[PDB]
RNA sequence: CUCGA
């Protein structure tokens, strides 16, 4: 019923109030390591690598 | 208006655990602070809770 | 093998009794009249194993079995 | 004062005097242990008591014994440096002398055969440190103490909740120590029952036929006979009026010529004071009435026939008839009243089956052995070793002392055994209860719960690791050959280094202890668990045993607990809170007499303080002692009411009795709540140790006693001046009269230099002294982690401004300014340890070399030539810190990788990298590196450099140990022989060597000289024996565990500063986590420049009630005040007689200061080191419930030229305008906490999936994904999602072919699910299929 | 088992 999940993260949260509703902070360390095979079929199209 | 009562007025009738109501009450508040029985009386009711 | 193994716990039990201090496999060699990497060779067979639902903590929640790691897998990089 | 306090001294506002100082904080633990290791004839605590008690045991047949001599703890094998280091159980080698005698066979008493007397070997039990740390693999343990229940008697009852309609059943248990629980309850049907051991329930008079008792004798031990007689066929009974004492006059009683009472008649107590004033002997009474009486004993028909009746059975007319008829004259019957005396055991007698002694231990048999055929030697034996055997069954002297009194006895001593006297004093007691007389007993009363330290503990296992030996050795001395036996052999070192290795490192009490304080190292000490063996559980304690019982007043704290599952069960000791000997919590108190309050101290327990009268600590008093307002508020059992001067018999000591140590830390904890004071004292035991530690301006004056205590700084044993400073060691010269008359007066403390804790944290000891002063008896010389000139200071105090700031201080958050960051107030240290196991795999071992495939230059330029670290290499994220290869087997290839390994000539070998690099998001500094190796392995270039350089750092310090010891020695003898022999140049001109040459003539003087010669003699070769084992120590292999080849261990140091994310709180359980650090332009600053450096939120304190925030934020203002007062008179440099002027006038403000400081007799250059110590600001001291007044804080900001109403007009940083109304501003002591963010922060995309499951693993030192449990498949099912339901259960998780395919799609740029069954779906097929099962799909 | 929400 309940698995564990790949493609995830944790963190402290914390306040922010220049944001909009609909928007939420990141910190770069994690959606480098989140956003990881989008990054790759990104730079394999732009023949980056 | 619950909560200002506990910082000018006097704290109402604590109870001890038995649920029977003490007789004496806690005549003292937040702000004059409370004595040494007094404080130990008012351990009752927050470790209830 | 149980023999070789019980001769080298007797004589294990013994030096402890003796000397006082537990026995190194170089001077159990000597009285085991064996040489050394023999003495470290059946002092390697034993220790039956692990059960995987045992808790290494002191919890009952985190079982042995839930930190094995899978090593036969392909990685999704390498494929 | 002293000459160490004659710097910053602490300005007390507390009133009461003092009459008690505070003890030694860890008093239970080492008090504990000096009972279970020293040898006692007399008392017998600790081994001695389990060796006597087991010991001695004889063989089976009885022609042998062995005896008992003595034991001896040798010396530990290696110190408690080194245990720390290898990773060995720091431990003591226990000894013991065993006698073991022969006796003859055909002899009668026959002793003389042999006498055989060895010294036997038996385990280790592992020593305590100084602080009551055990030290078990290298690891610090603690183990804590334990509440459970008292060994005794104990009546219960149930408020209901078992039968309808009331009957309330009084139960009543028998706890022993060790052995069988005897119970009794009674019935809906008031009749009697024994549940032994808590088995199926057995009528309650069958123990009492057990123990060889009649029905005749049971009726006449518990009830009480009623006389009849019949003469000349009349039927008049014999009355005593105490008996017939409430019932209905059915009839009407008689006198001679007086009728004494009316009928149908409510017999009054006044009837029966007329029917006691003249005379009831006989009363003619009808026939009817003898109808529904019991008899008593076994009228038989004494001439012809056989029994007529046996006892416990009616009287009715016809067998009365034929009592008559045999002639009787004295019919007895029990005194059955409906309300008073009941007939529980003539219910009981009948429903029992049983009928005899020998069919009575058969239905014992057959309830606690079930479907066994008894026989009769087989069932006596089972009812005598229950209950009546010395090894069996153990009340061990405080069940019996505790059985004694229940019962109302005298005697104290007794056996450990039972009785057939205890269990008929049981019945009777509980019948008593039954019927209205005595009453019922409570669990939660602390006299009826005692405390269980390590002493106790650890010889209770001592005693079943010799029980599992005694069981071999009582069976090998009837195996035969009892001529060349000598008794070393019998004996083996298993099972006892088997139980005291499992109690110290596997026990739910031997728990690991908190390091990252000197307060959480204290409090974790004094810390009363209620868990363990032989007490509760998390799961099956109500709202009952979790409550502050009334009791609890001056023993266990209320407001230092735990709040997660376990909020109730961990207690925590109060502060004077003593042990008493048997184990029960005593606390001290003031005699009271005739009013006169003296100082005489008295420690009473739990069941002694309800009796008398006790007033409270905030009792006002007079000069010689009296009570001066006349009717005081008191306790007296249980309850809380007003009295009058002369009944009290008892008054409280001080006003810190009621809290813990960790809770009389906080400042205006009687203003607070109690929810946020708990909060505030559970979370002061984390704050992490800072850079540089920084005092508390406003304290409780309890800062002193906790950095002293906890053994975390240096202290001065003898007094002295001090004669060389340096940042590792201290050498302090002593004074002429504290000295000793064989030594040489040189003390030297080596101070521990950057290590590593149990929590990661650093551990670091400055000096605090400057060289060439005067330091007393009991100083502080060495501040360790969190203290300051010997003040306990956890984290530092700056600029607080309760205002709403943009939002950035929304919900319980912090907004702090960046000279915070700049100045580095809180930047801690955190030492981490990295290791790199060199296993031994069967294809070839593995090797640490420099050559590494597959990496180029870039990675190993910093590794040296043998292949480690170099010292102090800043390291990043990934490099690799010791290069280590290891031997792959050889594989199948790939074709096109076959085709590429053809076309160019790369051939990789069979060595593969596995390596040790730095885990990610870590920078440092590598500051320590340690290598051990197996016996019969070639070190290495740097495991050599590193043992050469142990070598000289071992003799190094040893000669530095000889040579300033020398020195002192000889200026010994000079100090002697100048007052002696006035030589002051033929001393001087020779050789210094040739001092014990030289002769003073025939005094003392000179045999001194010799002493101290001879004292040199020992000096010359200690060092010489110390450093051979030093040397042997050292250069030694080392000792691994199987299958390894070397081990090397890397300390790196990490440096933290503060971000957004680090968990910062202050005293009074206000949390928060840091959002922004702005610039030091934009903060909110006053009208004088200085801007505000935390600005807090206010919307905080009415939800909450912790108003001791906004006071201490008052005070440390007003501290701040003088303390800026104080450098505005310094930087000016005015005078010294200014300085008197004003610091004088700042140290007493109160009304009824309790102390009285001048500065007359401070001489002209102590008021300049004094006045430079109060630059930062004046520290002010401020107790528990004895605090500062609200006029005293605005008599103080009066005094430094501030507002008194606290609140200044804060300027805006970014706009330039000012608020409307005035702001809070002050100084709040605001602490760091353990929850850093970058040990929170964690992602992870692919890797490391589970063996069986295959989904994928947990934990972020194992790389692991978050768990999304069915709490949230509920969530995600209710929005309708069902394509987030789809991909979030197969193609991320638990497919096999599912997330390979995923992979290779979104790499090629092709979003596109792609389904499949579960993996954890066809392993429950697999596994409900194995039940013979068949399930299938379709 | 201890700790955090």
Redesign the pocket.
Same mark, same amino acid.
């Given at each position: 019923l309940g698995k564990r999940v790949d493609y995830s993260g944790r963190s402290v949260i914390t306040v922010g109030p220049y944001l909009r509703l609909h928007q939420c902070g990141l910190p770069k360390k994690m959606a480098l390591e989140l956003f990881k095979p989008f990054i790759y079929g990104k730079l394999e199209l732009r023949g980056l690598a | 208006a619950a909560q200002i009562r506990q910082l000018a007025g006097m704290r109402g009738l604590m109870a001890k655990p038995d649920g029977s109501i003490i007789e004496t009450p806690i005549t003292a508040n937040f702000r004059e602070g409370l004595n040494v029985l007094q404080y130990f009386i008012s351990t009752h009711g927050a470790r209830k809770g | 093998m149980i023999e070789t193994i019980n001769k080298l716990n007797r004589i294990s039990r013994q030096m402890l009794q003796e000397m006082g201090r537990e026995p190194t496999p170089e001077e159990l060699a000597e009285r085991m009249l064996m040489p050394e990497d023999k003495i470290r060779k059946v002092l390697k067979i034993a220790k039956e194993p692990i059960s995987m639902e045992t808790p290494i903590? &002191? &919890?009952? &929640?985190?079982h042995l079995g839930d930190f094995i790691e899978d090593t036969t897998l392909e990685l999704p990089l390498d494929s | 004062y002293s000459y160490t306090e004659k710097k910053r001294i602490r300005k007390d506002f507390g009133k009461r005097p003092q009459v008690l100082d505070v003890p030694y904080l860890l008093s239970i633990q080492l008090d504990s242990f000096q009972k279970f290791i020293e040898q006692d004839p007399e008392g017998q605590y600790g081994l001695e008591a389990a060796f006597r008690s087991v010991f001695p045991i004889q063989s089976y047949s009885g022609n042998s014994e062995l005896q008992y001599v003595s034991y001896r703890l040798g010396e530990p094998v290696f110190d408690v440096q080194e245990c720390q280091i290898r990773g060995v159980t720091y431990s003591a080698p226990l000894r013991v002398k065993l006698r073991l005698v022969i006796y003859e066979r055909e002899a009668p008493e026959g002793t003389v055969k042999d006498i055989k007397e060895q010294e036997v070997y038996m385990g280790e039990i592992p020593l305590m440190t100084d602080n009551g740390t055990f030290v078990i693999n290298g690891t610090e343990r603690v183990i804590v103490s334990q509440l459970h229940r008292s060994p005794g008697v104990f009546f219960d009852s149930d408020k209901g909740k078992t039968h309808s309609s009331g009957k309330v059943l009084y139960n009543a248990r028998i706890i022993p120590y060790r052995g069988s629980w005897l119970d009794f309850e009674f019935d809906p049907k008031d009749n009697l029952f024994v549940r032994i051991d808590r088995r199926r329930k057995l009528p309650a008079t069958i123990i009492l036929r057990a123990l060889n008792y009649t029905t005749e004798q049971i009726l006449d031990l518990f009830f009480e006979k009623v006389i009849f007689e019949i003469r000349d066929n009349k039927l008049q009974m014999e009355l005593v009026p105490e008996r017939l004492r409430g019932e209905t006059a059915s009839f009407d009683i008689e006198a001679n010529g007086k009728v004494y009472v009316e009928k149908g008649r409510r017999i009054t107590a006044r009837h029966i004071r007329q029917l006691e004033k003249d005379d009831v002997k006989l009363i003619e009474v009808p026939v009817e009435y003898i109808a529904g009486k019991v008899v008593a004993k076994d009228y038989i028909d004494e001439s012809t026939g056989e029994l007529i009746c046996a006892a416990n059975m009616e009287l009715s007319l016809d067998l009365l008839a034929k009592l008559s008829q045999s002639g009787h004259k004295r019919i007895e019957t029990l005194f059955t009243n409906d309300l008073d005396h009941g007939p529980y055991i003539s219910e009981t007698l009948r429903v029992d089956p049983t009928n005899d002694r020998l069919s009575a231990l058969v239905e014992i048999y057959r309830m606690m052995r079930p479907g066994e055929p008894p026989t009769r030697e087989a069932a006596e034996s089972l009812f005598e070793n229950l209950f009546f055997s010395e090894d069996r069954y153990d009340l061990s002297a405080v069940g019996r002392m505790k059985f004694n009194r229940s019962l109302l006895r005298e005697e104290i001593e007794g056996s450990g055994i039972l009785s057939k006297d205890d269990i008929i004093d049981v019945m009777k007691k509980l019948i008593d209860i039954r019927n209205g007389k005595g009453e019922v007993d409570d669990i939660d009363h602390l006299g009826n719960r005692r405390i269980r330290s390590v002493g106790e503990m650890a010889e209770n296992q001592f005693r079943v690791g010799l029980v599992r030996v005694e069981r071999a050795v009582k069976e090998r001395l009837s195996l035969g050959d009892l001529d060349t036996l000598m008794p070393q052999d019998m004996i083996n070192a298993k099972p006892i280094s088997a139980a005291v290795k499992e109690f110290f490192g596997s026990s *739910?009490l031997s *728990?690991?202890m908190?390091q990252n304080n000197p307060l959480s190292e204290i409090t974790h000490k004094r810390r009363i668990?209620a @868990?363990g063996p032989g007490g509760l559980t998390?799961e099956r304690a109500g709202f009952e045993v979790r409550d502050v019982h009334p009791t609890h007043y001056g023993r266990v704290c209320p407001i230092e607990?735990?709040?997660?599952? +376990?909020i109730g @069960?961990?207690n925590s000791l109060s502060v004077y809170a003593q042990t008493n000997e048997y184990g029960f919590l005593e606390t001290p108190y003031r005699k009271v007499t005739d009013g006169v309050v003296t100082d005489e101290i008295h420690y009473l327990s739990a069941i002694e303080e309800g009796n008398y009268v006790i007033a409270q600590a905030n009792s006002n008093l007079d000069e010689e002692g009296h009570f001066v307002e006349d009717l005081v508020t008191c306790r007296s059992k249980g309850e809380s009411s007003l009295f009058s001067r002369d009944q009290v018999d008892y008054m409280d000591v001080s006003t810190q009795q009621v809290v813990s140590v960790g809770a009389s830390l906080i400042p205006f904890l009687e203003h607070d709540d109690a929810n946020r004071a708990l909060?505030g004292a +559970?979370?002061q035991? *984390?704050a992490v140790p800072t850079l540089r530690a920084d005092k508390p301006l406003v304290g409780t004056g309890m800062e002193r006693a906790v950095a002293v205590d906890s053994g975390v700084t240096a202290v001065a044993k003898r007094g002295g001046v001090v004669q060389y400073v340096d940042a590792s060691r201290i050498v302090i010269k002593v004074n002429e009269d504290e000295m000793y008359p064989g030594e040489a007066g040189i003390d030297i403390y080596n101070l521990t230099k950057y290590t590593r804790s149990n929590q990661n944290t650093c551990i670091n000891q400055m000096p605090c002294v400057s060289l060439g002063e005067p330091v007393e008896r009991g100083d502080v010389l060495a501040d360790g982690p969190s203290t300051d000139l010997g003040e306990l200071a956890l984290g530092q105090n700056m600029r607080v401004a309760f205002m709403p700031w943009n939002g950035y201080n929304f919900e319980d958050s912090i907004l702090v300014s960046e000279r915070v960051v700049q100045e580095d107030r809180f930047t801690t240290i955190h030492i981490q340890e990295l290791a790199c196991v060199s296993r031994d795999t069967k294809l070839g071992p593995e090797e640490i070399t420099a050559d590494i495939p597959n990496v180029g230059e870039a990675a190993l330029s910093k590794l040296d030539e043998s292949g480690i670290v170099y010292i102090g290499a800043e390291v990043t994220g990934g490099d690799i810190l010791v290069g280590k290869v290891t031997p792959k087997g050889e594989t199948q290839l790939t074709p096109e990788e076959k085709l590429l390994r053809a076309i160019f000539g790369e051939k990789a070998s069979d060595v593969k990298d596995s390596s040790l690099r730095v885990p990610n998001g870590v920078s440092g500094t590598v500051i320590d590196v340690q290598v051990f190796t197996r016996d019969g392995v070639e070190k290495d270039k740097r495991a050599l450099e590193i043992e050469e350089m142990q070598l000289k750092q071992a003799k190094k310090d040893l000669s530095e140990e000889l040579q300033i010891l020398e020195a002192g020695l000889f200026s010994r003898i000079r100090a002697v022989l100048v007052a002696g022999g006035v030589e002051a140049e033929k001393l001087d001109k020779l050789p210094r060597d040739r001092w014990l040459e030289l002769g003073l003539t025939d005094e003392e003087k000179q045999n001194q000289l010799e002493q101290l010669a001879e004292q040199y003699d020992e000096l010359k070769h200690e060092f010489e024996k110390k450093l051979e084992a030093k040397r042997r120590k050292i250069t030694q292999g080392d000792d691994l565990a199987p299958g390894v080849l070397k081990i090397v261990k890397v300390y790196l140091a990490v440096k933290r500063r503060i971000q957004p994310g680090d968990?910062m709180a202050g005293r009074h359980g206000n949390?928060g986590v840091i959002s922004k650090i702005n610039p030091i332009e934009d903060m909110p600053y006053d009208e004088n420049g200085t801007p505000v450096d935390i600005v807090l939120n206010p919307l905080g304190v009415p939800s909450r009630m912790n108003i001791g925030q906004i006071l201490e934020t008052h005070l440390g203002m007003a501290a701040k005040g003088i303390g800026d007062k104080i450098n505005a008179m310094l930087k000016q440099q005015q005078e010294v007689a200014k300085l008197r002027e004003f610091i004088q006038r700042a140290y007493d403000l109160g009304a009824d200061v309790r102390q009285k400081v001048d500065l007359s007799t401070f001489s002209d250059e102590e008021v300049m080191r004094l006045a430079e110590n109060l630059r930062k600001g004046m520290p002010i001291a401020t107790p528990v419930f004895d605090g500062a007044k609200e006029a005293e804080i605005k008599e103080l900001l009066k005094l430094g030229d501030l507002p008194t109403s606290g609140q200044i007009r804060l300027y805006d940083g970014r706009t330039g305008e000012q608020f409307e109304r005035p702001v809070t501003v002050g100084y709040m002591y605001m602490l760091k906490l +353990?929850?850093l963010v970058d040990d929170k922060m964690h992602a992870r995309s692919t890797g490391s999936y589970s063996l069986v499951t295959q989904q994928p693993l947990g934990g972020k030192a194992q790389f692991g994904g978050q768990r999304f449990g069915e709490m949230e498949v509920w969530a995600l099912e209710a929005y309708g999602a069902a394509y987030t339901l789809q991909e979030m259960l197969t193609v991320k998780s638990d497919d096999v072919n599912g997330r390979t395919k995923m992979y290779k799609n979104i790499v090629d740029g092709n979003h596109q699910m792609e389904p499949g069954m579960p993996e954890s779906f066809n392993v429950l097929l697999k596994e409900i299929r194995s039940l013979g099962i068949n399930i299938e799909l379709e």
């Amino acid at each position: 019923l309940g698995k564990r999940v790949d493609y995830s993260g944790r963190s402290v949260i914390t306040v922010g109030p220049y944001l909009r509703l609909h928007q939420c902070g990141l910190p770069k360390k994690m959606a480098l390591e989140l956003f990881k095979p989008f990054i790759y079929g990104k730079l394999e199209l732009r023949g980056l690598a | 208006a619950a909560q200002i009562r506990q910082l000018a007025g006097m704290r109402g009738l604590m109870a001890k655990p038995d649920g029977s109501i003490i007789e004496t009450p806690i005549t003292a508040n937040f702000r004059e602070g409370l004595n040494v029985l007094q404080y130990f009386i008012s351990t009752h009711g927050a470790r209830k809770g | 093998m149980i023999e070789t193994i019980n001769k080298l716990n007797r004589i294990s039990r013994q030096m402890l009794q003796e000397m006082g201090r537990e026995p190194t496999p170089e001077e159990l060699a000597e009285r085991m009249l064996m040489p050394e990497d023999k003495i470290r060779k059946v002092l390697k067979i034993a220790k039956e194993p692990i059960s995987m639902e045992t808790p290494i903590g &002191d &919890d009952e &929640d985190s079982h042995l079995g839930d930190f094995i790691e899978d090593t036969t897998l392909e990685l999704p990089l390498d494929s | 004062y002293s000459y160490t306090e004659k710097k910053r001294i602490r300005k007390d506002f507390g009133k009461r005097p003092q009459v008690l100082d505070v003890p030694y904080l860890l008093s239970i633990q080492l008090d504990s242990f000096q009972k279970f290791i020293e040898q006692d004839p007399e008392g017998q605590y600790g081994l001695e008591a389990a060796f006597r008690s087991v010991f001695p045991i004889q063989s089976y047949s009885g022609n042998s014994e062995l005896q008992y001599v003595s034991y001896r703890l040798g010396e530990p094998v290696f110190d408690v440096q080194e245990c720390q280091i290898r990773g060995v159980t720091y431990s003591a080698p226990l000894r013991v002398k065993l006698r073991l005698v022969i006796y003859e066979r055909e002899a009668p008493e026959g002793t003389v055969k042999d006498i055989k007397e060895q010294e036997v070997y038996m385990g280790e039990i592992p020593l305590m440190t100084d602080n009551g740390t055990f030290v078990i693999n290298g690891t610090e343990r603690v183990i804590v103490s334990q509440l459970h229940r008292s060994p005794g008697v104990f009546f219960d009852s149930d408020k209901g909740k078992t039968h309808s309609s009331g009957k309330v059943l009084y139960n009543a248990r028998i706890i022993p120590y060790r052995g069988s629980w005897l119970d009794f309850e009674f019935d809906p049907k008031d009749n009697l029952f024994v549940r032994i051991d808590r088995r199926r329930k057995l009528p309650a008079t069958i123990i009492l036929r057990a123990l060889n008792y009649t029905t005749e004798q049971i009726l006449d031990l518990f009830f009480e006979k009623v006389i009849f007689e019949i003469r000349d066929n009349k039927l008049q009974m014999e009355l005593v009026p105490e008996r017939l004492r409430g019932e209905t006059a059915s009839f009407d009683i008689e006198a001679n010529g007086k009728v004494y009472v009316e009928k149908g008649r409510r017999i009054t107590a006044r009837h029966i004071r007329q029917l006691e004033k003249d005379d009831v002997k006989l009363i003619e009474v009808p026939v009817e009435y003898i109808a529904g009486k019991v008899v008593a004993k076994d009228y038989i028909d004494e001439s012809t026939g056989e029994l007529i009746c046996a006892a416990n059975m009616e009287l009715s007319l016809d067998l009365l008839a034929k009592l008559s008829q045999s002639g009787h004259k004295r019919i007895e019957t029990l005194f059955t009243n409906d309300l008073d005396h009941g007939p529980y055991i003539s219910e009981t007698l009948r429903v029992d089956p049983t009928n005899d002694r020998l069919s009575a231990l058969v239905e014992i048999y057959r309830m606690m052995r079930p479907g066994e055929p008894p026989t009769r030697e087989a069932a006596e034996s089972l009812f005598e070793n229950l209950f009546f055997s010395e090894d069996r069954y153990d009340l061990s002297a405080v069940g019996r002392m505790k059985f004694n009194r229940s019962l109302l006895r005298e005697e104290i001593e007794g056996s450990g055994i039972l009785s057939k006297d205890d269990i008929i004093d049981v019945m009777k007691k509980l019948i008593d209860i039954r019927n209205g007389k005595g009453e019922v007993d409570d669990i939660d009363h602390l006299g009826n719960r005692r405390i269980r330290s390590v002493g106790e503990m650890a010889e209770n296992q001592f005693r079943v690791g010799l029980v599992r030996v005694e069981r071999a050795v009582k069976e090998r001395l009837s195996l035969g050959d009892l001529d060349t036996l000598m008794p070393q052999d019998m004996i083996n070192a298993k099972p006892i280094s088997a139980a005291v290795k499992e109690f110290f490192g596997s026990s *739910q009490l031997s *728990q690991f202890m908190d390091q990252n304080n000197p307060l959480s190292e204290i409090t974790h000490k004094r810390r009363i668990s209620a @868990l363990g063996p032989g007490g509760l559980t998390r799961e099956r304690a109500g709202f009952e045993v979790r409550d502050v019982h009334p009791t609890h007043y001056g023993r266990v704290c209320p407001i230092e607990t735990p709040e997660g599952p +376990n909020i109730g @069960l961990i207690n925590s000791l109060s502060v004077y809170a003593q042990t008493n000997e048997y184990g029960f919590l005593e606390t001290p108190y003031r005699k009271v007499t005739d009013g006169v309050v003296t100082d005489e101290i008295h420690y009473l327990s739990a069941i002694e303080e309800g009796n008398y009268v006790i007033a409270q600590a905030n009792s006002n008093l007079d000069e010689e002692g009296h009570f001066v307002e006349d009717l005081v508020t008191c306790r007296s059992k249980g309850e809380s009411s007003l009295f009058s001067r002369d009944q009290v018999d008892y008054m409280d000591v001080s006003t810190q009795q009621v809290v813990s140590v960790g809770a009389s830390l906080i400042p205006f904890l009687e203003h607070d709540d109690a929810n946020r004071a708990l909060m505030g004292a +559970n979370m002061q035991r *984390q704050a992490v140790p800072t850079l540089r530690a920084d005092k508390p301006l406003v304290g409780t004056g309890m800062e002193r006693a906790v950095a002293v205590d906890s053994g975390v700084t240096a202290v001065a044993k003898r007094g002295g001046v001090v004669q060389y400073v340096d940042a590792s060691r201290i050498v302090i010269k002593v004074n002429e009269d504290e000295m000793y008359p064989g030594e040489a007066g040189i003390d030297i403390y080596n101070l521990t230099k950057y290590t590593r804790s149990n929590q990661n944290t650093c551990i670091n000891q400055m000096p605090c002294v400057s060289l060439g002063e005067p330091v007393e008896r009991g100083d502080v010389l060495a501040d360790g982690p969190s203290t300051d000139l010997g003040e306990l200071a956890l984290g530092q105090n700056m600029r607080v401004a309760f205002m709403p700031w943009n939002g950035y201080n929304f919900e319980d958050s912090i907004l702090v300014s960046e000279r915070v960051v700049q100045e580095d107030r809180f930047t801690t240290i955190h030492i981490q340890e990295l290791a790199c196991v060199s296993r031994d795999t069967k294809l070839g071992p593995e090797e640490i070399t420099a050559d590494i495939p597959n990496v180029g230059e870039a990675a190993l330029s910093k590794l040296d030539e043998s292949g480690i670290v170099y010292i102090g290499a800043e390291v990043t994220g990934g490099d690799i810190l010791v290069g280590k290869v290891t031997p792959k087997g050889e594989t199948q290839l790939t074709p096109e990788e076959k085709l590429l390994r053809a076309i160019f000539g790369e051939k990789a070998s069979d060595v593969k990298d596995s390596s040790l690099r730095v885990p990610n998001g870590v920078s440092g500094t590598v500051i320590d590196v340690q290598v051990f190796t197996r016996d019969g392995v070639e070190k290495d270039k740097r495991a050599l450099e590193i043992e050469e350089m142990q070598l000289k750092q071992a003799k190094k310090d040893l000669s530095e140990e000889l040579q300033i010891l020398e020195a002192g020695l000889f200026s010994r003898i000079r100090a002697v022989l100048v007052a002696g022999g006035v030589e002051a140049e033929k001393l001087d001109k020779l050789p210094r060597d040739r001092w014990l040459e030289l002769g003073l003539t025939d005094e003392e003087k000179q045999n001194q000289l010799e002493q101290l010669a001879e004292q040199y003699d020992e000096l010359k070769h200690e060092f010489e024996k110390k450093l051979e084992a030093k040397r042997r120590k050292i250069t030694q292999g080392d000792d691994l565990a199987p299958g390894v080849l070397k081990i090397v261990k890397v300390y790196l140091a990490v440096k933290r500063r503060i971000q957004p994310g680090d968990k910062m709180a202050g005293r009074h359980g206000n949390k928060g986590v840091i959002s922004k650090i702005n610039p030091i332009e934009d903060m909110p600053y006053d009208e004088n420049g200085t801007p505000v450096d935390i600005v807090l939120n206010p919307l905080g304190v009415p939800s909450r009630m912790n108003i001791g925030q906004i006071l201490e934020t008052h005070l440390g203002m007003a501290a701040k005040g003088i303390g800026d007062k104080i450098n505005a008179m310094l930087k000016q440099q005015q005078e010294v007689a200014k300085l008197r002027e004003f610091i004088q006038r700042a140290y007493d403000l109160g009304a009824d200061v309790r102390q009285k400081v001048d500065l007359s007799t401070f001489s002209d250059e102590e008021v300049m080191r004094l006045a430079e110590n109060l630059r930062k600001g004046m520290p002010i001291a401020t107790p528990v419930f004895d605090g500062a007044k609200e006029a005293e804080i605005k008599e103080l900001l009066k005094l430094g030229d501030l507002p008194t109403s606290g609140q200044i007009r804060l300027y805006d940083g970014r706009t330039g305008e000012q608020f409307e109304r005035p702001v809070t501003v002050g100084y709040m002591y605001m602490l760091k906490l +353990n929850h850093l963010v970058d040990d929170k922060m964690h992602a992870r995309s692919t890797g490391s999936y589970s063996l069986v499951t295959q989904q994928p693993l947990g934990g972020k030192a194992q790389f692991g994904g978050q768990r999304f449990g069915e709490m949230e498949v509920w969530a995600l099912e209710a929005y309708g999602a069902a394509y987030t339901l789809q991909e979030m259960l197969t193609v991320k998780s638990d497919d096999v072919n599912g997330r390979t395919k995923m992979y290779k799609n979104i790499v090629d740029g092709n979003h596109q699910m792609e389904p499949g069954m579960p993996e954890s779906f066809n392993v429950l097929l697999k596994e409900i299929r194995s039940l013979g099962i068949n399930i299938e799909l379709e």
